Amino acid sequence: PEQFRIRRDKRARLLAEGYDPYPVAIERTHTLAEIRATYADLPTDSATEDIVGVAGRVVFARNTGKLCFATLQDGDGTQLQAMISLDEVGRESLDRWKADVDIGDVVYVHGTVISSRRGELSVLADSWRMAAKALRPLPVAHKEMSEESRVRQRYVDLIVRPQAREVARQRIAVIRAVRNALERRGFLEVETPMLQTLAGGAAARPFVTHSNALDIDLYLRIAPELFLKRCIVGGFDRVFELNRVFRNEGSDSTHSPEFSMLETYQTYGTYDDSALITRELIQEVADEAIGTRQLSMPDGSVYDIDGEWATMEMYSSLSEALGEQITPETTVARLRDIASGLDVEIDNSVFGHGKLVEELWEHAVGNKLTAPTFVKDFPVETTPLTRQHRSIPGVTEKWDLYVRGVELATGYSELNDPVVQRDRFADQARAAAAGDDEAMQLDEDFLTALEYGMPPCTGTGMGIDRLLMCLTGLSIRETVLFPIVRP
Ligand SMILES: C[C@H]1CCC[C@H](C[C@H]2Cc3cc(O)cc(O)c3C(=O)O2)O1
Ligand SMILES: N[C@@H](CCCC[NH3+])C(=O)O
Known part of the structure; x- marks a missing residue:
């Protein structure tokens, strides 16, 4: 000064x-x-x-x-x-x-x-x-800069801290490797809209903004899913989009309201086919962008992501952890008594069979996972866009992938029946009548596209910042050049 x-x-x-x-x-x-x-x-x-x-x-x-x-x-x-x-x-x-x-x-x-x-x-x-x-x-x-200073002045941080240049390079290399792995498999990259008249495809509060040209409220997209499915109706056979989404929620070490995501769609595959591709892609990305599948973590530990990954069913793995058989017919009352007996805090938001099962699974199984793991076959209440299971009642063909404790990716056999999809939106309407402001609203033009006939397909979603966190052990704010700061 x-x-x-x-x-x-x-x-x-x-x-x-x-x-x-x-x-x-x-x-x-x-x-x-x-x-x-x-x-x-x-x-x-x-x-x-x-x-x-x-x-x-x-x-x-x-x-x-x-x-x-x-x-x-x-x-x-x-x-x-x-x-x-x-x-x-x-x-x-x-x-x-x-x-x-x-x-x-x-x-x-x-x-x-x-x-x-x-x-x-x-x-x-x-x-x-x-x-x-x-x-x-x-x-x-660089030791003299606090962590918040690094985020507020990344341009100084890149000059004085070699690790800051290295993370920026890794991010660029990871994203290029992701695109390479999808191109080898015949996926085409498209652009779908970021300002939407109705923001669907995920469960999240949107950012809202006023349009001068149209004279209405618009929403930043929380996901590209409903527009990528229109692409599938239109004849794209393998299609992806790697770009920004926006969710008007809280901020922490795994959540940033603005973040980068990948979504892929592939006709004539199921969630078993996308689980295979997602594992291989992550492992190819590690090879290309990091140089190894034995990942050096900041604490000096080595995290092995090579090989085949374990798979488990939500209901059956939960049942094993508890010593009690949980099924789609287990009552809401029974699930709340199990939670209180395990001293599991249930936010006044979390209600319904599906959300209680996921909450219990996360506490009794998910939080104790170390190695990369797929959990599959979800409650139908919490998966409105996922096809129902081909043979097991009450569950849908969805998987979630956990890597290093982080929820990294998800894949569905996509619901393409337009009548059932309309039923799923009605169940979301009842949830929202009960006070869930994350519940999806019915999107009539999306249903119209399904009514022209969408071929069977499987879709995936993956957090790109979360991918880099999994590969490096960093928090979401360290992997983005310019994370948002309050002025
Ligand atoms: C596109 C999806 C598919 C499933 C994994 C992952 C979840 C997603 C959730 C999420 C919500 C949020 O409000 C802020 C965030 O930074 C993330 C994130 O990084 O990842 O990304
Ligand atoms: N739209 C999903 C990702 C793709 C789900 C599979 N169709 C999400 O935001 O979580």
Whole structure:
């Protein structure tokens, strides 16, 4: 702040002396990574006759009599030494280096490539220019930034913390690997709308906004599911969308109101076929983007995601954990007595057979899972868009995938019968009459699309930020460049 005034004074002084502190048209001949790669076998204390013009952020500096040193860091983190010698740039230019250049400044250095006496790959400057005067100093070390500071100023965090650049790179690589795995399998990527006149496809409160052009309220999508199914009616055979959804709910280490998700749809497959593809995709993504299926976690542990994953049924695994047979016919009263006997808090929101079964399963089974696990065959009350089971009464052909304790993905045999789907919406209407404001509202145009005939298909959904959390052990806020902060 005292430091801010000083740097601002320098900026103005340069502009008034004719030395442009934010010049345009600087040509950079090599990145620093290019210099380090080309000259990796340069002998110590030797010089070349190759002239280069590099640019980079000054992150370290040393001053002596006729010779100043500075460590430049390119945007990717690669570092190279710049040497400002009296006998090379001249009295007038060297003095300007000492008085004008500060830590954090972006500078351009033109000179010849050498290796210093200490074996440091360097550019021996014959000239230099300010490229971008910095008015604020960098933190002395990334340890000095709180976690909230990293989120509020990711642009500083990327400069000073190598792990921040590495997570950003992993995110980009994971998403590219996801698309590669789906392209190998013949899936096509489409765009469906983000502003919707009715937001369905999941159970969540929407963000609401007023349209000036249409003169009505619109909703940000909570899922692309109902529009991807219209694509299936229209003839897309294998289709996906990897992009943002928006849910107007709470924030914690596994939930962000704005997040990235993948949804896939495949005709003439069931939830058994999408469980197989989802496992292989995750494992291929690990290979391509992380380099291993034995995942290093931040606490030093190794998490094995290789091989085939366990599968279990919700009702039967719950029954085993409790020592009592739970079925679709178990009463709401019985389920509440079981919960209270296990000291399970049941929010005044959670009611109905289906929600009570899921709650008990999460407490007695789900929270105790370590290895990657599919749980399948869900209560029909909580799965309005899922086809009923081909042979077992009262359940639907859905699975959830848990990896490292995180709910990562889900897959359905899709409900394509338009009459039954209309019945499912009526059951949601009764739930919403009982006070559930997450219940789905009936979408008449979606039903109209089903009434033209949707081929049988299987769909999946996967949280992309959650995928990265599972691969790295990070929380959802560490995997996004710019998570939302209250101003
Ligand atoms: C697209 C779906 C399919 C099932 C797994 C996963 C659940 C999903 C829930 C969810 C809800 C929410 O309000 C905020 C969030 O960040 C997430 C999330 O990351 O993941 O993503
Ligand atoms: N729409 C689902 C993901 C796809 C479900 C399978 N059709 C969700 O948001 O949870």
